[PDB]
């Protein structure tokens, strides 16, 4: 759900959308994430590993 559940009910929202929203939060716009989703996933998995 992202942040929504910290405010009221847990509004279900798929992770891609949640991350695109987070990117738009910091002035990057959704197109960056939806054109690099595989790269972001690889970087996140590598960092968490």
């Amino acid at each position: 759900s992202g942040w929504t559940f910290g405010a009221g009910p847990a509004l279900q929202i798929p992770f891609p959308m949640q991350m695109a929203y987070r990117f738009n939060g910091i002035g990057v716009t959704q197109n960056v994430l939806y054109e690099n989703q595989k790269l972001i996933a690889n970087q996140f998995n590598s960092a968490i590993g």
Binding site: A20, T29, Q30, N31, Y34, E35
Partner: protein, 66 residues
């Protein structure tokens, strides 16, 4: 995540795309209000190949009829 009108991904400038089953709309994040998906509320950047989960639907140009 995006709408492909003609080989071009249309991401929402503000809000997330929603569909009432059959017709897709743009609405805010913390309140539901459907608006027709025009070029005003969406900005195009891409090639409709890399984004995953994109649906086709259609967009309405408010300038072509006039």
């Amino acid at each position: 995540p995006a709408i492909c009108h003609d080989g071009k991904a249309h991401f929402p400038r503000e809000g997330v795309f929603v569909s009432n089953g059959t017709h897709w709309f743009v609405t805010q994040r913390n309140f539901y209000e459907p608006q027709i998906i025009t070029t005003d509320n969406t900005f195009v950047s891409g090639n409709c190949d890399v984004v995953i989960g994109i649906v086709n639907n259609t967009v309405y140009d408010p300038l072509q009829p006039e």
